Amino acid sequence: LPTMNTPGSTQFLTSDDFQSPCALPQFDVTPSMNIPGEVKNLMEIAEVDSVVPVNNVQDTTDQMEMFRIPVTINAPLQQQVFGLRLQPGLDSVFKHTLLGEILNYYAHWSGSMKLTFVFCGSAMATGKFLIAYSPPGANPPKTRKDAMLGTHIIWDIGLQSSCVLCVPWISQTHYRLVQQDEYTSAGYVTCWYQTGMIVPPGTPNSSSIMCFASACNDFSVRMLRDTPFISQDNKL
Amino acid sequence: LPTMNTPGSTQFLTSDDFQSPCALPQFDVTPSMNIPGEVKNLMEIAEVDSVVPVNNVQD
Amino acid sequence: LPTMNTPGSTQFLTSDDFQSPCALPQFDVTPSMNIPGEVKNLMEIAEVDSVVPVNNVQDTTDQMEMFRIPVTINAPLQQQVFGLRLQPGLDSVFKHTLLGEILNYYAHWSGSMKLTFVFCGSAMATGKFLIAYSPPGANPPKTRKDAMLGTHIIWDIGLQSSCVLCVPWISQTHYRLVQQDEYTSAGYVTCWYQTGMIVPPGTPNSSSIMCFASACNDFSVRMLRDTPFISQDNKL
Amino acid sequence: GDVEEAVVHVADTMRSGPSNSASVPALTAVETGHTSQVTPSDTMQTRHVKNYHSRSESTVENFLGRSACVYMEEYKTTDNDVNKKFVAWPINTKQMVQMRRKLEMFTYLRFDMEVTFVITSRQDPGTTLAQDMPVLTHQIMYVPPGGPIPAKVDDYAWQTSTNPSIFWTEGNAPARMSIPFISIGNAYSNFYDGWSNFDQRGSYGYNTLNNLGHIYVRHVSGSSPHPITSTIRVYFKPKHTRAWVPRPPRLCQYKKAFSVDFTPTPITDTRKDINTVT
Amino acid sequence: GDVEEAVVHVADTMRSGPSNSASVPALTAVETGHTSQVTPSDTMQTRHVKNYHSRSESTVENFLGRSACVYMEEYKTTDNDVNKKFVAWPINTKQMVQMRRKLEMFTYLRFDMEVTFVITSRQDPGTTLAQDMPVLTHQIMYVPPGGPIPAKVDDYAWQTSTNPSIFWTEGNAPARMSIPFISIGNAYSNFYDGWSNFDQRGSYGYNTLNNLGHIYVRHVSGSSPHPITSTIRVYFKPKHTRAWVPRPPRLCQYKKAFSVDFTPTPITDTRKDINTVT
Amino acid sequence: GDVEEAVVHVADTMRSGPSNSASVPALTAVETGHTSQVTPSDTMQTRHVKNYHSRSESTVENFLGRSACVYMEEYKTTDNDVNKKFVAWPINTKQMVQMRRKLEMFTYLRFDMEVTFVITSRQDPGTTLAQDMPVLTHQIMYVPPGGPIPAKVDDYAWQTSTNPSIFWTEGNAPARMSIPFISIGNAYSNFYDGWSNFDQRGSYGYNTLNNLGHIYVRHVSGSSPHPITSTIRVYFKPKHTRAWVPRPPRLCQYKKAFSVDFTPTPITDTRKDINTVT
Amino acid sequence: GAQVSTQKTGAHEIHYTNINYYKDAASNSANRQDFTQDPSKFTEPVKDVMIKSLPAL
Amino acid sequence: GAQVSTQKTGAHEIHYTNINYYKDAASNSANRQDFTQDPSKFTEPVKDVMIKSLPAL
Amino acid sequence: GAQVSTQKTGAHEIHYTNINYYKDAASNSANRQDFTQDPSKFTEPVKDVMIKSLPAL
Amino acid sequence: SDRVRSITLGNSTITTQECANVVVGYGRWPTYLRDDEATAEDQPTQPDVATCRFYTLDSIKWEKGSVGWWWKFPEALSDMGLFGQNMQYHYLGRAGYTIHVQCNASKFHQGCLLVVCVPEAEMGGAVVGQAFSATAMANGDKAYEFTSATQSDQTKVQTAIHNAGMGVGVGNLTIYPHQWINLRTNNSATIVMPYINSVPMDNMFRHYNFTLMVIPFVKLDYADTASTYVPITVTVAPMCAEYNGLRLAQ
């Protein structure tokens, strides 16, 4: 049967799908067992919440302190609680979270995100907070009046101790680069005092808040790549 | 299956049409968008008028 | 017909299945004859009994002595007859038996085993014996009270001169390694005097017992390997 | 089921006779921006002609469906300079003039890609060349943007676990692969009249949208007693092409790989006078 | 008979208008261990959007379906040290960092394996290199646990009668083979929090369950007048994969090939203050 | 017509409860030469278990279906001794120990054969090695019993007209061929307890029935200015196998290629005493 | 004994044949065409179903 | 799963078979058999249709 | 003239085609798909059938 | 109300008037081994009620400086009632578990605890390339203390809290089944852990099926009160337990 070899023959492509001979002919495999916890897609992992280390103050002698956002009883009428860049795969805040780790194995991402805040103060304490997301622009907000123009939610602390801020997917392109640059910016997220925290007598004067990050049901990734967080110099 | 290679095997012809493996398996492409001004044949461009520089007087 | 060679072409794999040209074209083979004793599976061989050399006392000047387990008329009320490790493919006792030889050509094994004991004393002699199998544990049994807790059978010597101890397959894994280690231990087997041996006047004061080893109908092996018992240094 | 089965000639001339009427097909007005649709049959007597010519070879698919070199570089198997033993090229189609001009006739493109690699080797000159070396092997690695980049020939990054790669041995056919449409946008853009920062500052031009990654090449383990130099050529061949918004072909010679800068050029050549025809 | 014949896009956004009611989707309680299922449509007005994005590339099958190097070693065709003329590697996936981390994201795995071997050779430097040697040939032998192990290049054990082996000649395509699921248990275990002895003593960790065997390689009969060095790289490519019980990715650098030992590491990098966003 | 289309797990355990009766499955009598067919269900309470284990890998077809080396020899392209430039091997399966023991587990065998040849070359050491030689070619010739035998490399007998032969060039895949069942009897015999002469004299043992012929190998026309040594390895792979009358495996080491001679060996290893279990 | 199935393409704007040559299922090519998934296992591991609109507690 | 289609020839004075081997549509061969075209987009971009025979204005 | 048959897989959780190219049956591939066996030949070579439950003698 | 839960196992009952929902492993409820999945042949023993009951595993003290604690199972219950005896006398074991953690404080206290069950929680030694005994990681029901600073003693495990002694980010432990005890609205966390292993059954003295971890993510704080610490109690109840391969007692 006449034949002609085309270019690419005898090459080894690491991502090919070809049949090959079996070295252990007629090997009987062990019967399957339905172990609990089967995972069929990394996105299922990506959708689980994880604590975000927002308090990266360059002076954290205690590592666990990075997870707590300080709050005080007597604050200037309007005062910023925190601010951060929305770069889930590049910013130091999201770099090592359960979501950031998955993204670092890819190059493109798209979809919305969830940020959940939980108040871990006393039961008698109360307050209100304004959390706003500012799409990309030439300047990040500096005061509450600037922040309130963008997407935001007013959070009231009560019996329900958690509030969810859904960051919508507002972008000019269907996808964004994990190694984000100026062209594919995503904006900023900030939190401000809405009313202030009030406490009765006989309670601590300070409290803390924690943030959780996760992906919505429309999130996706593409173009698999090798992560840069792990490296070696010599064979183990 | 017996076979025999004919002349021309292992050559690289710049105008060939052969199937080749995909390096990015199961890559999801961006949805298509009907941008105005699609061109399907260079002759469509060739049929448009253009100014002719007839006055080539060397001065 | 355009084609491209994939990795693995022109390699010689010792366990491949490919068609090849015949060098003796149209050769007429001799007619077949149904010789008695056709064997279609090595397990059929593995299921046949064979004598186990249990008496490996490091002082056997006579090799045939290894096959006989001594027994005496006047023994301490409780006394151990023998003890051994259940490593059919590794223990010296089972290493060279008809079953051990087959196993040494493989890497994994599973299923139950049969141990058959036959009393070769006088016709007037009588006695009872306790044979027990102790699953894996931190310590092998030291006395009859310890042994009787595990699987065991009380053997009565009478007209029927043989008794069968079926070792059940109790393991955490579907398979065990022939080159057994601590992780895949199998236990121990021991025999003890139940009542003692009594003889009338005019009979020998000593007797012997023999053991036979074989596999049950649920036994199996997998992963063929090269046996280590045979070796050479120069071409014959 | 076993088999499922699956041409447009140019317009024909039509017989035209003498005419005398008020209709004036010859006269028109270009001010409307409309190109006249007149035919020779409308100004002169013509015979009936059947045309079998076809415009098959003018389709964009065929026009761009030819492999063209886009980059060539040299690396040595052994040398003192570490940077000289491997290649690191940011992917871009502006390096070679011919294919650059071919692509720049359209503003937006969307196509699949077919990549072919041609590798050749030669022994460097020297005072002593007598040596015996088995066949060499080469590794090509593709690093999407943001991935780790090797800093030396024997770096750990060469152990690709997710980055696709090809291992090739000299003497066989050139390596080949296919690449789908991998742009974040809906189509590739040859031109981009805009800036990077929202304040209209920073990088300007098509340099802003070039984020396709890098390609690295090395000798797998060859290290000869004497230097050996290798050269690699990369060829691109668009497939399944679509184009939008045609543009005028470039008149001035290229001068930069990431800019439109140029020097003024005359419109065309000159002749003795407006009547010279010889 | 002659032929028998044999897609799930992400969820679409839905138009949402102004609302004023007692329902409060935004408020929840994380104490339950339940991740909120809210969507942007539940907190802001949104338009109707059809999503054609798919999560095809995030499947475990595709995530792990890439060949990665797991071991590399060098052996010489001729030398004084007998142990230096062949390789003997106990199979394990903990040697290379990248694939180790990739696999360690799951507790239990069950997959078929595809093994590819890349072999290259080079002439050692010396004062005299002029020689002529035909093409070399290599033998790869797999020894299940407990089998005989060769002690020298020309040992009798190299006459495999049951042990599978591959003979390969330089200049051809890399060798390849397939391996089924060969674990005694129902699934491979990356971690094992337990001991070897029932008295909670002896070996500890995943080192206890590593009993996959060995691999040996040698030059079939090549013995040059001058030394020649060869290197072999082994690549693993899981197929038909299933995974259970996901785990958090490793944060600290690896330090041992058969242990989880590590050094404490900061959670992440630092910035000027909690408000810095530049 | 275009297509025509064309599993036995081990026995399952069955629930067994307490029993008290006159039946005594445990008691038997080995004097009958009958192996007891008892099962664990007959002596202890057991649960219901479904077994999916299969004995596929224990079949004789698979047990013997592995290629194994049977002979290796060296010949030179050029030398003074004529007998040293080619090989002449009488076919027999008793040369290599491993496959010999594998085959000797059965008394009679009947199978097709698949033969593969592996050839490698190397340059002999010397004071001057600088030379250039094109690729070598080798000839393998099979001579049924009684045929002419060459006496030198360039003998006339190498012009085979009826004797099958293979010509092979270095650098390609190993040569292969198939051989049907070519025994005058109804089955191969590994053992033969008898003599050659009818008066019970002459040759004794399996040496009498070995009349399979010879194999010869040479370099077709290569004759280098300097010596070059080549080695050939022969591999046999039974196919379509049938066996009869199993025998006990050999305990003593082999000492002759055409005899059963041996030296007495201990039955097995020893231990401290009959009760030692540690 | 040939299988015909669709190949990956695009939303708005396609068959390949496969045949198995070896007797061992481990020799087949990767079955990377499955896209079923269910995240409720890890996101909703609670016993009592909670309605998103209703208060959590 | 084989496609049969005509090949380029001449006017006055012819089938080939194609089969896809890979699961990715990007691996197929070039589809250079399409010859549809419409130049009115660039030659007649006006709003009101103009008859060639009638005066332009 | 193509044979289609099942290939080895697993219990809980599959066709290949074969064609012969040579005229000699010795050229075919190994027929390692047979799993019939009967051990009664070597384990029960007695003349009178013995019931396991009943006494041997 | 949905803040009231009651659980009844064997002859013991648990009542909580202030609790959140109940987390069920990976959505899988504990169950007995099926016939088509087992491997051992002999009849198992199901000592229901005798072994399936709650067992209070001692109590710790939560201070302002506490860092966390961990327990390993089933070794923690090695000497607790008939469960321990049956564990000792049998070669193989298999059972799910119900973990209930109690921690109550006034409406003027503040703090947050993370309760998580980590299956296959392998741990690394304090000094890389230095082995530890089976006493620096499990010694019965006693709780082990995490450390704020890096461990230095070579005879014990690396107790660096931020790395969880497994060389991973502490904040990512949410992936495993878990619940939070926030003093503002919760006093107890309940987790139903099914049997997870690569084999149908396993020796319960050689293998640690899973590890429980309680980590204060927001340190306890209070002011002007006579209560100096908040005790924390853990209670565990094996479920659908069955043993196999009886032998002498370990």
Ligand SMILES: CN1CCN(Cc2ccc(NCc3ccccc3F)cc2)CC1
């Ligand atoms: C500026 N032009 C825009 C269009 N773009 C087309 C294009 C897209 C991808 C590739 N990939 C080549 C490749 C193949 C294999 C491995 C790595 C690779 F980068 C080529 C061209 C070209 C640039």
Ligand SMILES: CN1CCN(Cc2ccc(NCc3ccccc3F)cc2)CC1
């Ligand atoms: C610790 N991981 C567990 C999973 N295991 C998968 C695995 C299983 C078998 C093989 N065999 C490779 C091989 C191929 C050909 C000949 C001999 C061989 F050993 C590889 C990986 C990897 C280790």
Ligand SMILES: CN1CCN(Cc2ccc(NCc3ccccc3F)cc2)CC1
């Ligand atoms: C003692 N055993 C008896 C069985 N016999 C099997 C056998 C039969 C023929 C061959 N021929 C090998 C061959 C192939 C090609 C050319 C010439 C040849 F001799 C091999 C084994 C082996 C010896």
